[PDB]
RNA sequence: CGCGAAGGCCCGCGGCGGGUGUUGACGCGAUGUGAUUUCUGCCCAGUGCUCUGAAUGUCAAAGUGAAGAAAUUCAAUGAA
RNA sequence: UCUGAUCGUUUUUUCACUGACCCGGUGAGGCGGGGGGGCGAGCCCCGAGGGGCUCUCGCUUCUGGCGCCAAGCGCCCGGC
């Protein structure tokens, strides 16, 4: 039925269409400004990060401020052709997001360390 | 000068009502077909205390006759009403306490409470803690009725507007001396927050033209017109008389 | 019907406190979109207020059976349209060079649409029929045209709808139309109309002027009037 | 043409087409704003005498101010 | 002492605005005195407040008449 | 001297209508007319067969239970 059974009148829903523009609003997709070579700035080497790299089987990196833990995993995995188990990312007082990359048991955190240049 | 206390009691501020904890309004129910020509039957589920009122309400539970659910109201509870009672509501519901029926179909002399003003406003007159409006004499032509409100003024009320029978429970409240400054405090904290009054004669002559002086004396004739501007109009307003 | 084993009737009781009321039409009670309660009561005001004769003369309209006769005649004399004015324009221009024929010729009789065109051919006493849409949007556009038609001696008739007068032509709506000339075969058919049109509109024009509408109180309000007057009766 | 007849009519004010019509104006400025679009002028001549024509791109709003 | 809600007291530059009011005279609002006990005397002239009002003394916009050529002059009528 | 009260105007007083305007209720849920039908009541005639009239009902009050998303009937049409 749906002619008159309730005492209220509501808006009768109509049809809707989606945009089919006769030109793209902007010219071309804007390439990323945040890729592998920008989200892993450089490895860190201090007296803390050296205990971390030789004992806990992890690395240490410094990472752009806007970067998930899901994003840091992909970068290091694709950069050095490595594996990552888990990542921990504090943000230092200066404002740089320090990242602790726990390394997969199948790999040797020293042998990866020599490759990336840090002693 | 500055505005006297009682001249910023309308600004809508600190002098609001304290209505955080109040259980709900107090209205009978909207007039519909089932109430106009027949009578609908409801239970008194639980009687509760509504803070800031010496007339405890009552959660009556009805049945919607054109859909399927349970509807609840907050009637002002008449006296004698107890939980698990079948309260009726309408035009053909017989006389008995706590059972609304429209003045006009109730005999001359029947005591009502929570009487409506005009048909459909769901209860306005004679609903304090233990007051009652009396019906006097119908007039089956022009469809009017005369009620004797609690003050004493006889009103020519329109008929066909409803009123729950019996006095309002909670009566005889003002017979215990409060006896304490604090016990009056706790009473006025639960309502609009305006308790401790300070006489005009005490405040310096800015507030209350009464004030000032060197003997704490009014100085001005107390009785005031009602054409007087808003700000002098203090004391015995528009006094038709005075003295004991 | 042979007896069924255990099929039950099981009726229902309807009323105050009994089983729940059914779902039936509330056509009179539904809170309408409030844009129509404007357009709805406007139908009621023009029944209540004393509508003056200059306006109320627009209710009394040409009958149906007479209307189809006229609309038949107008169907013969509609104006040219796009896409065939165009093709004749293609036929017109492309024949100019050859020398046998050329662009323009004589114009056979056609209607005339706008009130600003009709009148300008009415006070010159050139209009035979005058048809007025009975419901023009500002009714001030034709509130003066009847009294003009009578003073000039012109048969005029009022049809229902400005939209179908917009179909005798090819636009959304057309306030007015007027026959200025016809061909000799249909001239019999025209006089059959004006001999009955002007007996009801032009001839009794003085009857129309002394007429006033409105005051038709509501059925709830008028049934009470009858009942109480019956009581005195 | 009709415009002269229209012009000579609105000079003779004190009508009811003006009273039948305030109610149309006074209500629906609440169903919509006190500023809404009319689809076409309710005064054809006066709009035209003031510069309005009937072509595309022209709009006509009705606006209600309070006296005093 | 005011007030039965087209209400009392009040806010507000303004609206079918807002507070008391999710309230209704055993209530809201305005005062004065200051537990209980025992009493609360005389004055309505003065100053206020309120109550009613035809035969109405005064009484302003409109409004009505009279004279003038008109601006105007005059008169009656007259709410709080 | 009152010679209709007709179509016409206005000073008018009192009452009535509602359409302007205002208030209140609602999930804007059965408002005003007219009959179908009667457990019944009555008013009246009347061949006991019935005929005319007035009242009523969406027809429920010992129980802190349940109550919607149609049964039944009537008319079509399709698959196999």
Summarize this, please?
This is part of a larger assembly, with chains A (119 residues), B (244 residues), C (233 residues) and D (68 residues). Chain A is an alpha+beta fold and 119 residues long.
Structural overview:
- Chain A has a 4-stranded antiparallel sheet, sandwiched between helices.
- Helix content of chain A is 26%, strand content 18%.
- The radius of gyration of chain A is 25 Å and the shape is elongated.
- Chain A has 4 helices and 4 strands.
- Chain A has 119 residues and is α+β, with helices and mostly antiparallel strands.
- In chain B, a hairpin with a 5-residue loop joins strand 8 (144-148) and strand 9 (154-158).
- Chain B has helices at 33-37, 181-189; strands spanning 39-47, 57-63, 70-76, 86-90, 101-102, 111-113, 133-139, 144-148, 154-158, 162-165.
- The two termini of chain B are 34 Å apart.
- In chain B, the strands form 2 sheets. Chain B has a 6-stranded antiparallel sheet, with no helix packed on it. Chain B has a 4-stranded antiparallel sheet with strand order 3-2-1-4.
- Chain B contains 2 helices and 10 strands.
- With 233 residues, chain C is mainly alpha-helical.
- Chain C has helices at residues 36-48, 53-56, 64-76, 85-94, 115-118, 145-152, 187-197, 205-209, 219-232; strands at residues 129-133, 156-159, 176-179.
- Chain C has a 3-stranded mixed sheet with strand order 2-1-3, covered by helices on one side.
- Chain D is of the alpha+beta class and 68 residues long.
- Chain D is globular and about 40 Å long.
- Chain D is 41% helix and 12% strand.
- Chains in contact: A-C, B-C, C-D.
- Chain A binds chain C through residues 1, 3-9, and chain C through 23-27, 29-33.
- The structure holds 2 RNA strands.
- Chain D: The modification Phosphoserine is found at residue 33.
- Chain D: It is found in: Cytoplasm.
- Chain D: Keywords: Cytoplasm, Isopeptide bond, Lipoprotein, Myristate, Phosphoprotein, Ribonucleoprotein, Ribosomal protein, Ubl conjugation.
- Chain D: Component of the large ribosomal subunit. Interacts with IFIT1 (via TPR repeats 1-4).
């Amino acid at each position: 039925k749906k002619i008159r059974t309730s005492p209220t009148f509501r808006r009768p829903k109509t049809l809707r269409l989606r945009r089919q523009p006769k030109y793209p609003r902007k010219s071309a997709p804007r390439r990323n400004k945040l890729d592998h070579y920008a989200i892993i700035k450089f490895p860190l080497t201090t007296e803390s990060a050296m205990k971390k790299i030789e004992d806990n089987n992890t690395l240490v990196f410094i990472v752009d401020v806007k970067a998930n833990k899901h994003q840091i995993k992909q970068a290091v995995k694709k950069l050095y052709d490595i594996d990552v188990a888990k990542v921990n990312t504090l943000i230092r007082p200066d404002g740089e997001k320090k990242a602790y990359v726990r390394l997969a048991p199948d790999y040797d955190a020293l042998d990866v360390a020599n490759k990336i240049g840090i002693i | 000068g500055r505005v006297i206390r009682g001249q910023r009691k309308g600004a809508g501020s600190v002098f609001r009502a304290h209505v955080k904890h109040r259980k709900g309004a107090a209205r009978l129910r909207a007039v519909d077909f089932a109430e106009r020509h027949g009578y609908i039957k409801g239970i008194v589920k639980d009687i509760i205390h509504d803070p800031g009122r010496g007339a405890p309400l009552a959660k009556v539970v009805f049945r919607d006759p054109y859909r399927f659910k349970k509807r609840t109201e907050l009637f002002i509870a008449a006296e004698g009403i107890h939980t698990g009672q079948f309260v009726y509501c309408g035009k053909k519901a017989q006389l008995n306490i706590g059972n609304v029926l429209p003045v006009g179909t109730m005999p001359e002399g029947t005591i009502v409470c929570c009487l409506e003003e005009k048909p459909g406003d769901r209860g306005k007159l004679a609903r304090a803690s233990g007051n009652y409006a009396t019906v006097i004499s119908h007039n089956p032509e022009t469809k009017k009725t005369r009620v004797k409100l609690p003050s004493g003024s006889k009103k020519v009320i329109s008929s066909a507007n409803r009123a729950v029978v019996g006095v309002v429970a909670g009566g005889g409240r003002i017979d215990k001396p409060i006896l304490k400054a604090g016990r009056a405090y706790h009473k006025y904290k639960a309502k609009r927050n305006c308790w401790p009054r300070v006489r005009g004669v005490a405040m310096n002559p800015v507030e209350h033209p009464f004030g000032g002086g060197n003997h704490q004396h009014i100085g001005k004739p107390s009785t005031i017109r009602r054409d007087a501007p808003a700000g002098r109009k203090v004391g015995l307003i528009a006094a038709r008389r005075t003295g004991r | 019907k042979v007896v069924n084993p255990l099929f039950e009737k099981r009726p229902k009781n309807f009323g105050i406190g009994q089983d729940i009321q059914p779902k039936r039409d509330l056509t009179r009670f539904v809170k309408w979109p409030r844009y129509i309660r404007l357009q709805r009561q406007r139908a009621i005001l023009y029944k209540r207020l004393k509508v003056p004769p200059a306006i109320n003369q627009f209710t009394q309209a040409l009958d149906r059976q007479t209307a189809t006769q006229l609309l038949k005649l107008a169907h013969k004399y509609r104006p040219e349209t796009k896409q065939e004015k165009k093709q004749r324009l293609l036929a017109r221009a492309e024949k100019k060079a050859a020398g046998k024929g050329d662009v323009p010729t004589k114009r056979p009789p056609v209607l005339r649409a706008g009130v600003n065109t009709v009148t300008t051919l009415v006070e010159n006493k050139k209009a035979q029929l005058v048809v007025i849409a009975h419901d023009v949007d500002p009714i001030e556009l034709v509130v003066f045209l009847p009294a003009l038609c009578r003073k000039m001696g012109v048969p005029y008739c009022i049809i229902k709808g400005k939209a179908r007068l917009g179909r005798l032509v090819h636009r959304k709506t057309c306030t007015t139309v007027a026959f200025t000339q016809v061909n000799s075969e249909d001239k019999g058919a025209l006089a059959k109309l004006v001999e009955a049109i002007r007996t009801n509109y032009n001839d009794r024009y003085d009857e129309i002027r002394r007429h006033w509408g409105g005051n038709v109180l509501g059925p709830k309000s008028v049934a009470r009037i009858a009942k109480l007057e019956k009581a005195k009766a | 043409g009709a415009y002269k007849y229209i012009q000579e009519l609105w000079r003779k004010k004190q009508s009811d087409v003006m009273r039948f019509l305030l109610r149309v104006r006074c209500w629906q400025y609440r169903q919509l704003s006190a500023l809404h679009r009319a689809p076409r002028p309710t005064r054809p001549d006066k709009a035209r005498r003031l510069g309005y024509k009937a072509k595309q791109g022209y709009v006509i709003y009705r606006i209600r101010v309070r006296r005093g």
